[PDB]
Amino acid sequence: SGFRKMAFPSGKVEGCMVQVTCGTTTLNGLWLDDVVYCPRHVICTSEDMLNPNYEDLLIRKSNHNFLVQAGNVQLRVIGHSMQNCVLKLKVDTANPKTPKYKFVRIQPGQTFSVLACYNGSPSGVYQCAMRPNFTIKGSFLNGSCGSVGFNIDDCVSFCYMHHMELPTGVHAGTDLEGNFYGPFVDRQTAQAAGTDTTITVNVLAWLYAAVINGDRWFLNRFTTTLNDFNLVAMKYNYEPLTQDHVDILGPLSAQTGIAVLDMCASLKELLQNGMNGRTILGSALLEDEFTPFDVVRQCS
Amino acid sequence: XVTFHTXXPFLXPXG
């Protein structure tokens, strides 16, 4: 019994984390087979970041301009190319600990685990959600660029690589194909994080987790229509619950016996009259950073 | 501005 912010085990990814230095600039890289993937701003300098031309900068770089270290062991760069905001460094040795992997782009609202790394050494692992405005509320210090996010399906799904911190203390990054989540750019310019909303399907999944764990005070007798629920939800800056969200809650409704619209009604109550100083699962706010899948894993 | 979490960080032009 119990419920906790639970990350995937990190061991498969720890063995892929290397250090990548380009002159003065250092960050982490992902070492898969005989390629190392890292944020392409490693080839810049602080002066460049204002308006940088990455195309030329890469031309003037040569393989020797890149120092890759995996542990004490140096890796030799024998080629370099650029895919969107991600740099791909070809190396002589294939990573012996390469796991079965695949590059996925995640939808906003889905969660992943983040392995925070410094100078290619892992420091910790935590869970994160892709907010609806395509930012994540991570925990990153100077030198963590190139940390990655993943899910495990024994196949690792890499889905996030860290690039910058927005002014609100919130982070932005790319997928392993180099494309930024959201509208952000690896150049020094004014970049706003949009107005955020709450991930409805996740708050629901969380309430199911509460019921499974014996916390059911908030269950009511009423029901609602999906459309009438969305009318109340949007008023509270909640994401509109979709038919595809409804199917995904399926396992949780089956396990508890509580249908989805039953729970939507219980949530409507909480949204209107608040909690009245009570805790659902020891938390006094509503939690929206657990996907339905996440609940199924911990309550299987 | 934004901050890039190199190193070594690209900061705040800002100043």
Side-chain angles (χ1 to χ4, degrees), chain A residues 34-220 222-295:
Chain A
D34 64 341
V35 181
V36 176
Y37 305 77
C38 71
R40 70 172 180 178
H41 63 270
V42 67
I43 54 164
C44 297
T45 51
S46 208
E47 189 263 31
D48 273 314
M49 273 333 264
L50 292 141
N51 162 302
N53 209 290
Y54 288 96
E55 312 288 352
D56 322 79
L57 268 38
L58 200 56
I59 298 171
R60 313 201 225 102
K61 311 271 121 191
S62 291
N63 291 341
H64 55 254
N65 280 126
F66 295 105
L67 210 185
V68 172
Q69 312 225 259
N72 270 135
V73 155
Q74 196 195 358
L75 307 170
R76 157 193 216 122
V77 177
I78 75 198
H80 52 116
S81 38
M82 159 179 310
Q83 179 181 9
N84 297 315
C85 290
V86 155
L87 194 81
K88 301 141 92 183
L89 303 172
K90 198 97 170 44
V91 289
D92 49 6
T93 311
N95 183 3
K97 305 164 165 224
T98 298
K100 223 58 154 204
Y101 73 93
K102 85 222 208 184
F103 290 169
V104 313
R105 186 172 181 86
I106 56 164
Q107 227 73 9
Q110 155 89 305
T111 52
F112 52 97
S113 293
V114 164
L115 185 62
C117 297
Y118 297 94
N119 294 328
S121 175
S123 175
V125 52
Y126 57 86
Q127 273 269 129
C128 250
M130 183 58 77
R131 304 309 309 183
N133 56 23
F134 301 93
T135 65
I136 74 163
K137 291 198 226 113
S139 177
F140 298 120
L141 305 178
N142 305 336
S144 63
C145 269
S147 302
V148 300
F150 56 103
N151 290 287
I152 296 183
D153 281 12
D154 53 330
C155 175
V156 177
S157 288
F158 296 109
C159 62
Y160 177 82
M161 180 177 267
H162 182 45
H163 281 59
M164 86 213 55
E165 179 168 288
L166 291 190
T168 21
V170 143
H171 316 101
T174 73
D175 58 24
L176 271 299
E177 277 171 30
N179 299 296
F180 261 91
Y181 286 97
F184 306 111
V185 288
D186 52 350
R187 101 190 157 83
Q188 269 293 3
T189 165
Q191 300 181 75
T195 328
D196 212 25
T197 36
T198 304
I199 321 190
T200 321
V201 61
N202 284 8
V203 174
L204 285 169
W206 178 67
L207 291 177
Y208 274 100
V211 174
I212 306 174
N213 268 277
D215 224 316
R216 37 201 74 169
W217 59 262
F218 59 94
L219 292 178
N220 68 23
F222 322 153
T223 294
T224 169
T225 280
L226 181 53
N227 226 54
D228 292 357
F229 172 84
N230 280 346
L231 248 68
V232 186
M234 312 203 35
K235 309 222 227 213
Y236 297 88
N237 265 275
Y238 270 59
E239 281 283 307
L241 194 67
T242 65
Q243 273 307 333
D244 307 87
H245 294 171
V246 185
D247 312 347
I248 273 150
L249 284 172
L252 299 180
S253 31
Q255 179 173 5
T256 58
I258 304 173
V260 161
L261 287 321
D262 256 34
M263 200 66 91
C264 293
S266 296
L267 173 52
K268 218 191 245 182
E269 204 143 341
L270 296 173
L271 284 191
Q272 279 156 346
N273 304 37
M275 288 208 182
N276 176 39
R278 333 170 81 148
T279 63
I280 305 174
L281 285 165
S283 148
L285 285 157
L286 292 173
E287 303 282 319
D288 80 323
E289 305 225 349
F290 297 92
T291 68
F293 182 97
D294 289 356
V295 174

